[PDB]
Design a protein around this ligand. Structure first.
Ligand SMILES: CO[C@H]1O[C@H](CO)[C@@H](O)[C@H](O)[C@@H]1O
Length: 272
């Protein structure tokens, strides 16, 4: 497959096979960090407007090889690994990802600029997307993550910024957006719902009386998935793993999500 021009300037994610051009940039969800391809061929990260990182030979787990083709436009893109074509320096700067497991990874691996200023290549699969019209926004300290095996106790309001997820008194399971309107619901109100759980097997289920299944996300069989509610009202179940990062990452290290002091996971990757 071939690349298309990037069109998500200001978002936190650069999808696979999309060309990032000079003057284009990513922003972490919290707006603090910016990943910018400068007109002079330097790919840079800025912290509150100040360069704190530059893509070069000194970056651990990256390679630089010659670019012979003088016709190659200044461009940055992801094709499993990340590549920077900079003919002004006869160079291609690229990431040394961890060992690939399948060709599929080329289609689902994208780059994210996290709220902690790290850039991370993430092999990302949306198993279920309850709110397709709302953009997925990875790397936000804002987001609510639930690990498999989490009970949604009835009446408790789980928050993500101004958004919320609630297994309500009427038995409906509802996600509310920042404007207070519902972005998604299971439609289980008044059907006798007793229990709502993101199960260990990665399935989100609303149960009625006698363990009758009232609704489920059909995502069973994925114990590594997480349920994410975003501050923008998005709700989805995703199976994800990092395959590269500018810091923290090591090819042999075990990947894991940072945790709140409250033992809850956040949408930030770290290693070993
Ligand atoms: C008909 O209303 C129901 O569903 C909406 C969202 O669709 C909820 O917000 C509400 O509380 C009810 O359970």
């Amino acid at each position: 497959r071939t690349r298309i021009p990037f069109n998500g300037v200001g978002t936190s994610v650069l999808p696979a096979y999309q060309t990032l051009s000079a003057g284009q940039y990513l922003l972490s969800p919290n707006q603090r960090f910016k990943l910018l391809l400068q007109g002079d061929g330097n790919l840079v990260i800025q912290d509150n407007g100040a360069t704190v990182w530059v893509a070069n030979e000194q970056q651990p787990f990256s390679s630089t090889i010659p670019l012979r083709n003088k016709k190659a436009p200044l461009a940055f893109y992801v094709q499993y690994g990340a590549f920077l074509d900079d003919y002004s320096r006869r160079r291609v700067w690229l990431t040394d990802n961890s060992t690939f497991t399948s060709n599929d990874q080329w289609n689902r691996t994208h780059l994210v600029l996290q709220d902690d200023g790290n850039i991370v290549l993430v092999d990302s699969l949306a198993l279920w997307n309850g709110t397709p019209a709302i953009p997925l926004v990875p790397g936000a300290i804002d987001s609510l993550l639930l690990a498999p095996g989490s009970e949604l106790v009835q009446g408790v309001v789980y928050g993500a910024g101004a958004s919320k997820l609630v297994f309500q008194g009427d038995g409906n399971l509802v996600a509310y957006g920042p404007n207070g309107a519902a972005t998604w619901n299971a439609g289980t109100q008044g059907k006798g719902a007793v229990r709502a759980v993101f199960q260990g097997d990665g399935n989100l289920v609303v149960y009625g009386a006698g363990n009758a299944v009232l609704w489920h996300s059909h995502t069973g069989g994925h114990a590594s998935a997480v349920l994410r509610l975003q501050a923008n009202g998005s709700i989805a179940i995703l199976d994800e793993k990092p395959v590269w990062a500018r810091f923290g990452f090591q090819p042999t290290y075990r990947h894991i999500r940072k945790i709140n002091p409250d033992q809850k996971p956040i949408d930030i990757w770290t290693w070993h």
